Amino acid sequence: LQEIFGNFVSGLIILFERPVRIGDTVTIGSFSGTVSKIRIRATTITDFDRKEVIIPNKAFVTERLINWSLTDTTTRLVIRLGVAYGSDLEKVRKVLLKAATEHPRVMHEPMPEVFFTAFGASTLDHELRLYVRELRDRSRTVDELNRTIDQLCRENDINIAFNQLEVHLHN
Amino acid sequence: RQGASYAITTILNYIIIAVGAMTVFGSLGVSWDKLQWLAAALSVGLSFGLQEIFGNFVSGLIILFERPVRIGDTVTIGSFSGTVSKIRIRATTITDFDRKEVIIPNKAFVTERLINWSLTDTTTRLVIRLGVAYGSDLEKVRKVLLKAATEHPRVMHEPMPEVFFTAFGASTLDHELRLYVRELRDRSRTVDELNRTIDQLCRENDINIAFNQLEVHLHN
Amino acid sequence: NQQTLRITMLLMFALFGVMFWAIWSDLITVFSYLDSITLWHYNGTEAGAAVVKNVTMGSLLFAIIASMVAWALIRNLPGLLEVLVLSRLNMRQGASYAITTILNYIIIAVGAMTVFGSLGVSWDKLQWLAAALSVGLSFG
């Protein structure tokens, strides 16, 4: 009876304070999905794999929630790229920024930026950050950006290199 | 709100079922002596939730008074890095760098360990790796690395940047550069600019950055 | 601006109405008329004697007024506090926010206490929720 009533009060505080609601992506302990029901002792989270998670009511109050969509539903996504050592670091930057600028689904107030953040064992690492408004636009945007980045890569002739290594042969 | 309607209909549902049960048990009359056994269970069930609420109340009060965390400062708790945006009952909102709001319970701030990035000076230090080939000098590389730090208008001077040679790598000697920055938001740009100018000076002074190497003893 | 002006006008109107009620000498009769009704059967202990009475309509009006003024004043707290605090050159990064929240919290507490006192059920309320309040304060 104490378990039932504790889950009762947990449901009540979830309904009043509202840290989570219906129709917003949320992850709790690496379980990402959209909340679909708030009832006694149980909250249903439809995972992206169509897998319903029945989270107990106390877990929402006690644990830590990653509420993807609480105020602005905005998110930011990053794109990796590896560049060969014997190439320029400005044509690559302009190529990367062209895709972000000429994409009708990339925001402008947090203007996209290009970073060169790592000296890789074989490729210099470039990182692109850009913001998106709609949550459902995340997956398509990465695909389109990668396709156009590869096209511009083979166009401007800047080499994306595979992991390399030198050999000192002696027979 | 997004689901205020759903919440209110559920609440009226719940009140209606409660009043119906109360009326039915009153009509049956057994509810007069029912305050013997189930009363203790109801008491502890309500006590758990009210104790949780009031404990989060006192946690919010001590957070507001002692102030280990505040509004507008980067903080990480259990690998959750972000800026605190609200301090309320039972919940503190941390906007993560990925625009992902973390609702941390109030007791966690008092009980767990906080990494408060900006508490007194907002200063931070950043490090840069570099790998250098074996058959090259270890002073031209040092001067090249220090030139970028010295001639960067965003690198502090009171904690003067230094260059270290701290590891004999399997294929490259490892050089590490430490330099301080005042503004927190300057961290990402500074690394990019420093890496670009370091690569430029690398191809200028002609000191080789080597890929992982290995020797082969062929026999056919 | 507009909110502060509205709050000041409400305060002035409330003061004028209180003065008129205490001056017109007819609101006292209206006070008696309001305090001469019954709504529910309440009980308690007064002066060491068990007294059971009824909920006067004046009590209900006072409770409603207290709830309304509490709800109006909780939202009027932050700007009226910040305008004064902003002139104090602050004392910390979020000391102003903390102090406005604290006054909010005290205001809601005093409003709840007044409302439950007006309803009169708070006299016997120290039976059940008292233990929960005790353990909640004890933990912290």
Swiss-Prot record, chain C:
The subcellular location is:
Cell inner membrane
Q: What gene name is listed for this protein?
A: mscK
Section of the entire sequence shown = 787 to 926 of 1120
List the stretches on the Cytoplasmic face of the membrane.
Answer: 75-100
- In its UniProt entry, the species of origin is given as Escherichia coli (strain K12)
Q: Which residues lie on this side of the membrane: Periplasmic?
A: 32-53, 122-135
The family line of this record is: Belongs to the MscS (TC 1.A.23) family.
Looking at the UniProt entry, the stretches that span the membrane are 11-31, 54-74, 101-121
Which named protein is this? Answer: Mechanosensitive channel MscK
Function, as annotated, reads: Mechanosensitive channel that opens in response to membrane tension and specific ionic conditions. Requires high concentrations of external K(+), NH(4)(+), Rb(+) or Cs(+) to gate. May participate in the regulation of osmotic pressure changes within the cell, although it does not appear to have a major role in osmolarity regulation. Forms an ion channel of 1.0 nanosiemens conductance. The channel can remain active for between 30 seconds and over 3 minutes; it does not desensitize upon extended pressure. Its activity is masked in wild-type cells by the MscS channel.
